Amino acid sequence: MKIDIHSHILPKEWPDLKKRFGYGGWVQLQHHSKGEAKLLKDGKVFRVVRENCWDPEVRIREMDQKGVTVQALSTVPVMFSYWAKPEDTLNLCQLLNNDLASTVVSYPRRFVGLGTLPMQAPELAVKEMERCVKELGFPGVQIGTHVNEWDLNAQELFPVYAAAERLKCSLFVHPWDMQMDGRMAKYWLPWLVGMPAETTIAICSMIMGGVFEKFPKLKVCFAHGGGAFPFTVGRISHGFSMRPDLCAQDNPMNPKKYLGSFYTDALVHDPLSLKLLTDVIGKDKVILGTDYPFPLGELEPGKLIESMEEFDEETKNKLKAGNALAFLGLER
C-alpha cells in the first residue's frame, strides 16, 4: 500500500536506432492498436505491452485504484544494450534518462527515477551516473545482473561502485539477458527459473568478489526477493567454508557475514516465502516492489505484506515504505 521500488516504463516513441547508429540489433516500439504496442528486435515481435507501460496519466489512475503513492521508474531491461558500441549505448542512455526525468518533473510526488548506464564502458558509466545524480536528480540507477562476460565481482566495475559511494547513488540490480533458446525455450523457464538464478549469481558475485567489504557505503537492492539466495544461502555458505581454494581467493569472509549488507524487493508471491526472506535478509532490508505493469508482478500491491499475521504494524510499514525511503536516501 505505499512505495513500489520495482516498476518499468518506456518512452512513448523513440528514433530508428539502426539508422541512428549504423547497425541492427536494437529494439523499437510499434503502436499497432489503441492502447496497445509491440516491442521488436529487427523485425520480430518479442513482446506485447499496454498503454500503462508509457502513459504516466494511465499509471497514476491505476496507482490510485491500488493505493500506491510512489513508483520508482526504471526502463525495461532489454533496453540496457550493454552489447553495443560504448558511445551509442551512452547516447541511448541519455535519451531514456532524460525521458524519465521529464516524467518525474510532471508528477514529482508520485514518481522518482532510476536511470540506466553504459556499464560496458566504466568511464562513460561514471559520467552518466554523475549526470543522473547532479543534473536529473535521480536517487539511484537500475543495472543488470552481469555485463557481457563481467559478473558484478569484476574489478573493471570498481570505479562505478566508487562513484556510487561518493554520489550516494543507490543501485537496483535486475536480472536480464538470460538464456532464451535451446532447453529454456519452453514453459516460460527464462522468467520462472533463469531470472532467479541470474540474481543469485549476482549476489554471490558481489559477496565473494569483496564488493560489500571494499565499498561498505554502497546501497544495493536485488530484484525478485534475492532469487534463490534466501533458501540456498546455507548451501552457498557451507560450500565456501569447504572449498576456500575455489571460493575465498577474492574475499575470505564467509557469505553469511554479509546478511544485513544489502536489500531485496519483496516480490516472492507466497507468504511462506516472504517470511523466510525477512528471517534471512532482515525486516529492515525488504522493500515492497511490484514489477508493474508486467503480468509476473503482484496484482494487488502490498497485499502479501498486509496479509502477514506474523508482522506487527511497524514492520508492515517498513516493508511498504520505510525501507524504500532508507535505500533511496529520501525524505520519509
Question: x/- site string to a second copy, residues 244 to 283, per CB under 8 A?
Answer: --xx--------------------xxx-xx--x--xx---
Integer Cα distance of 124 and 283 in angstroms: 36
Select from Zn ion, a second copy, none the partner in contact with residue 192, using the beta carbon and a kind-dependent cut-off of 5 to 8 Å: a second copy
For residue 15, the minimal CB distance to a second copy (Å) is 31
Report CA-CA distances (Å) from 49 to 118, 197, 331: 25, 25, 33
Asked if 28 interacts with a second copy (CB under 8 A), we say no
Beta carbons of 207 and 155 less than 8 angstroms apart:
no
Helices (H), 51-181: 56-66, 86-106, 122-131, 158-167
Asked if 48 interacts with a second copy (CB under 8 A), we say no
Integer Cα distance of 132 and 233 in angstroms: 34
103 or 153: CB nearest a second copy? 153
Which helix (H) or strand (E) segment holds residue 306: the answer is: helix 303-306
For residue 307, the minimal CB distance to a second copy (Å) is 13
For residue 216, the minimal CB distance to Zn ion (Å) is 27
Select from Zn ion, a second copy, none the partner in contact with residue 246, using the beta carbon and a kind-dependent cut-off of 5 to 8 Å: a second copy
7 or 103: CB nearest Zn ion? 7
- Packing angle of the helix pair 229-242, 195-208 (nearest 10 deg): 40
List the interface residues with a second copy, window 223-242 (CB under 8 A). 224, 227-228, 230-240, 242
Q: Which amino acid is at 169?
A: C
How many other CB atoms are found less than 10 A from the CB of residue 127? 14
Asked if 291 interacts with Zn ion (CB under 5 A), we say yes
- Packing angle of the helix pair 229-242, 271-281 (nearest 10 deg): 40
**Residues in binding site for Zn(2+):** 6, 8, 174, 291
Where do contacts with a second copy occur on this chain (CB under 8 A)?
Answer: 146, 149, 151, 153, 182-183, 186-189, 191-193, 196-197, 200-201, 204-205, 208, 224, 227-228, 230-240, 242-243, 246-247, 268-270, 272-273, 276, 279-280, 295-296
